[PDB]
Structure 1
């Protein structure tokens, strides 16, 4: 009898290629039509290509321009050269042949089927982090498996993820501080994390608590993040221990064509430590001081991450407020820098919010088990976290094995100092609305629109 046998089905990276081949146990000359049909999980049969005895070739609009149906009557084989592959292609590919009998009737013949998988691992992490290093981990993953690991860093990913991941595909794995994850968990945008005891035991038990919402693990903890006072040792050997002595220092420095302190005033995460130093009466005190700095022309009105960073690295400002991630760019520059305790306000310390960098798996992802493999066996390893850390520092890693190395770093000590003086952010769904309320409040008071008393009024509502 006549039997069709398909081959060439495997795993590939989008943009890659695959040659399917279907050999018959009889001459193709006898066939009228030969063609390729595909079936994806839970869907109807979809013709992709066909070739008639008359040498005419037809294709479906999705594959048109990308796929070519070929035939070799010597080898008694029909081919499907699939170029520039996409995730929509992923399906079981079947070979079909039609034969007119001697009489009026015809015969349809089918094959076993050949599986084609187009898989890409996509990761969303912020641009201020070590995406290049995260890619080096992803490159080792592809060597040991065959899956592509692209690393993306889009603007406003914290508020682009819940919109795109809900409707569209978005990323497989999302990287952000633990505070944003409760809102994703409530909305149903994250898969429940199920790590075995042995993996679980590799990380500090306090770190796991930050990535827990209603008794379910919603992410993998990576590292603890806290803002510190970054200062130029040459321009300022004995930096301010108090916030209230910065105006004096600024007067001194402005005479020599230099600023005292430049940091991101737009993002409320950077201004919150000063606001929360005393506490309400504490928020009113802390903000009024911040307002007086802009009013006394000590700080610029629209001071953002880029002009603050650049100014410090250039050697224009004596101080800056930033996280572990910012250190590598300073090292690149020729600035003898120091990382230390944040200045105190009204005697009491400035309480910076503490973030736990965490990796979560998107609920609407087909690569949930592949991402778990990447996160556990490749990223959350000594070797894996090292790679990320040499690009842009992670801070105080969640890995137990890294304690000695963390403790040997003076900047980590300063980070941990500030983290103890601060507090970990609750993961709750209301954090988004809270942060927005503070973001507006600080900008309005900074520019000169709303009063300090009226800012806390609108923010408490």
Structure 2
């Protein structure tokens, strides 16, 4: 009897190649047609290619241009060279031979089947974090397993993720502070995390609470973040302990062609500490001072992340407000910088919002157990968090083993000093609408459209 035996089925990266071969126990000269069919999980039989005894090859539109069907009558084998592979190609590939016997009737022959998996582990993390370091962890993952790990940093990913992941494929894992994850959890865009006790015990029990929505773990905690006052020790050795003495320092510094403080005023995360310093009366008091700085021409109206970072790094401003991640770019510049407590306002301290960088698995991903492996056994490790921290600092990492190395850093001490004066963000689904209401309120008052009293009116609604 005639029997078809397929081979060449394995895992590859999108763009890579695979050569399937289907050998028979008889002469291919007797077969009229030979061809390859594919069946993905829970789908119908799909013909990809075929070759007739008359040497004419036909293909399907998806594989056309990428796959070629070859035949070797010596080796009694038909071949499918698959090049420039994609995740859509993934399926169990089957070989097929049709034989017209001496009489009118024919004989269809089939084989065992060969599995072909085109897998890619794609990660979404903000461009202000250590993505090159996260890629080095990803490169160590592909060495030990064989799965490609591409790291992406698209703009507005906090609001691009729920639109793309809901409809399209999106990423396998999403990295963002824990506050945005309650909205993703309510919407049903995140798979429930089920980590073993041994792994759970490696991180601080307080970090696991931040990534918990309605008694379910929705992400893996990476590190604790908190804004701090970064200052040039050469332009300013004894920096301000209070916000109210900055205008005086700016008058002193503008005479020498320098600014006192430049920080991102567009994003409300950076203005919120001053706004929530006293408290309402505390928000009105806090925002009026911020408006007075711009009204007195001390701070520019459209001060964004790029022109504030560049200004501090160039040595044009004496101070700036930024997180752990920002230190690597200052180290690169020739600036003798210092990280310290945020200035006090009306005697009380500025209360920043404490974020917990967390990795959540996308609910609409087929690579859930592969991402768990990556997050647990490779990223959340002493070696994995080191590779990320040396690119761009993570902040006070959630990993228990790092406690001594974090306690040796003068800047992590200033970050924890500000984190204690601040408070952790509630993960609730309303955070998105809240953050939008504060973002608009600050921009309107900064530019000069709405009054400080009318800003809190529209924001409280």
User: TM-score when scaled to structure 1?
Assistant: 1.00
- Using the alignment, how far apart are the partners of 1:195 and 1:354 within structure 2? 24
Deviation string 1:278-307 (CA, Å, 9 cap, x unpaired) is: 000000000000000000000000000000
Deviation of the 1:318 alpha carbon: 0.1
Q: 1:29 matched to which residue of 2?
A: 29
Shift in Å at residue 431 of structure 1? 0.2
The offset of 1:135, in angstroms, is 0.2
Q: Output one character per residue of 1:193-250: Cα deviation in whole Å (capped at 9) or x when no partner.
A: 0000000000000000000000000000000000000000000000000000000000
Q: CA deviation at 1:382?
A: 0.1
Equivalent residue, structure 2, for 1:259? 259
User: Using the alignment, how far apart are the partners of 2:278 and 2:111 within structure 1?
Assistant: 75
Deviation at 1:167, TM superposition (A): 0.3
Q: Provide the secondary structure at the position in 2 that maps to 1:78.
A: strand
CA shift digits 1:341-361 (9 cap, x unpaired): 000000000000000000000
Residue-by-residue CA offset, 1:298-333 (whole Å, 9 max, x unaligned): 000000000000000000000000000000000000
Q: Say which SS state the counterpart of residue 163 (structure 2) adopts.
A: helix
1:353-373 deviation line (CA, Å, top 9, x unaligned) = 000000000000000000000
Distance 1:302 1:344 in 2: 24
1:118-157 equivalences under 5 Å are: 118-157=118-157
**Per-residue deviation at 1:378?**
0.1
Query: How far apart are the structure 2 equivalents of 1:362 and 1:395?
Result: 25
Structure 2: distance between partners of 1:58 and 1:190: 42
Shift of 1:3: 0.1
CA offset at residue 386 of structure 1? 0.1
Cα distance in structure 1, aligned partners of 2:250 and 2:362: 47
Number of equivalences: 461
Q: CA deviation at 1:433?
A: 0.1
Deviation sequence 1:412-461 (CA, Å, 0-9, x none): 00000000000000000000000000000000000000000000000000
C-alpha distance in 2, partners of 1:451/1:48?
65
Can you list the C-alpha shifts for 1:21-68, whole angstroms capped at 9, x where unaligned? 000000000000000000000000000000000000000000000000
Gapped runs of 5+ residues in structure 2? none
The 1-side partners of 2:141 and 2:452 are apart by: 52
Instruction: After superposition, give the CA deviation of every residue in 1:229-273 in whole Å (9 maximum; x if it has no partner).
Output: 000000000000000000000000000000000000000000000
SS at match of 1:338: strand
Distance 1:332 1:292 in 2: 34
Counterpart Cα distance in 1 of 2:278 and 2:432: 23
| Cα shift at 1:122 | 0.1
Q: SS of 1:378's equivalent?
A: helix
CA distance in 1, matches of 2:94, 2:435: 53
Runs of 4+ with deviation above 2 angstroms: none
- Normalized against structure 2, the TM-score is what? 1.00
Q: Which residue of 2 aligns with 1:238?
A: 238
| CA distances 1:45-104 after superposition (whole Å, capped 9, x unpaired) | 000000000000000000000000000000000000000000000000000000001000
Q: Hey, what does 1:360 align to over in structure 2?
A: 360
The separation in 1 between residues aligned to 2:254 and 2:211, in whole angstroms, is 45
CA distance in 1, matches of 2:305, 2:341: 20
CA distance in 1 between counterparts of 2:156 and 2:299 reads 25
**Distance in 2 separating the partners of 1:259 and 1:406:** 32
Provide the rounded CA distance (Å) in 1 between the counterparts of 2:202 and 2:335. Answer: 36
